[PDB]
């Protein structure tokens, strides 16, 4: 009685599930071959990024022992990147399998203490990247909830956009890196909030008369603005 | 030719992906949904109404608010069944054995 007879058609018919499998098993069904994803992009640890940090390009220090070999983003990518899907793009900035910095705690109170001091969340440390489908499902659910909350809101799609950007930037595992990308949309939402309040409650100001040199040149047009 | 998509363009990549031989419905990609809160919400609402766990589990139903069904499954029914018959008989359409039915389906769906 053999185990899993009908379960490896990829093996029976020489079908590769990915170019890495194609290269390994020598099926040679990928016309364009395979450029292997190196190990420093397949795995690694979280690092510091800013140049105004002294430990830049250095691994993050934790209370627990952790491999200090860092994930290296793709800084010099090839011109032709035949697969431009999210699956292949995310590997240039994050590892698909998550970082190699996760702890295995000898006790529950160490876990408790790390959480209490802000140094551990399983959301962050025991987790993979999110797939495009998962991200899209989350974004559409969030959009539905917001539309139900209020349809007649002008900051709606801006909130939805910051959510989308956070999800795409993987803020569960790199929240500081994702917030660095998404705070612009947060600022825009902050602006839209006031822009809506001042339209609801009629707020205006006495504008001064027109300046003598509003136009720089007489033949120039003075385009009228509301 | 296929150039790198920076991280700032990924939100646009999710809803306007590049062309493939197997594309999704980009117009329906904002309509794909799958609620992880469906059954928890159902249980919470029923237990708040006052039912028991057994009553809640008997009254539970799976979410209808999921991604809509392909209309081709209702419009090209007979053509698809015939294509599947051809595939089952001819080993998945090896060396172009279901091209007749597949081409009829493609023309019907595409119209030039």
């Amino acid at each position: 009685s053999i185990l899993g007879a009908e379960a490896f058609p990829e093996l029976l018919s020489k079908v590769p599930l990915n170019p890495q499998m194609d290269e390994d098993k020598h099926f040679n069904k990928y016309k364009w071959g395979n450029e292997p994803i190196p190990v420093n992009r397949r795995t690694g640890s979280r690092m510091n990024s800013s140049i105004y940090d002294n430990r830049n390009h250095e691994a993050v220090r934790h209370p627990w022992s952790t491999d200090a070999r860092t994930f290296h983003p793709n800084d010099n990518p090839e011109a032709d990147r035949i697969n431009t899907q999210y699956s292949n793009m995310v590997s240039d900035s994050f590892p698909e399998g998550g970082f190699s910095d996760a702890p295995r705690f000898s006790s529950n109170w160490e876990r408790l203490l790390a959480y209490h001091h802000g140094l551990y969340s399983p959301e962050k440390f025991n987790s993979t990247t999110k797939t495009a489908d998962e991200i899209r499902l989350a974004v559409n659910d969030f959009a539905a909830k917001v539309h139900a909350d209020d349809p007649k809101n002008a900051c709606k799609y801006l909130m939805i956009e910051e959510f989308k950007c956070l999800q795409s930037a993987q803020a569960r595992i790199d929240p500081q890196g994702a917030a660095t990308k998404c705070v612009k949309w947060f600022n825009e939402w902050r602006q839209c909030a006031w822009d809506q309040e001042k339209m609801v409650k009629g707020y205006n100001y006495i504008e001064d008369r027109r300046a003598r040199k509003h136009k720089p040149y007489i033949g120039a047009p003075d385009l009228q603005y509301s | 030719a296929a150039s790198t998509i920076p991280i700032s363009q990924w939100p646009s990549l999710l809803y306007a992906p590049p062309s493939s031989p197997a594309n999704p419905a980009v117009e329906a990609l904002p309509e794909m949904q799958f609620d992880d809160l469906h059954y928890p919400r159902q249980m919470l609402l029923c237990r708040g109404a006052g039912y028991s766990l057994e009553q809640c589990n008997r009254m539970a139903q799976p979410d209808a608010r999921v991604t809509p069904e392909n209309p081709a499954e209702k419009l090209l029914k007979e053509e698809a069944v015939a294509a599947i018959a051809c595939l089952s008989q001819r080993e998945g359409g090896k060396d172009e054995q279901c091209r007749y039915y597949i081409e009829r389906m493609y023309k019907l769906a595409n119209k030039e």
Binding site: Y157, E161 | S12, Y15, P30
Partner: peptide, 8 residues
């Protein structure tokens, strides 16, 4: 579609 997918 959303208004921010427009860029041009």
């Amino acid at each position: 579609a959303s208004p921010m997918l427009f860029t041009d």
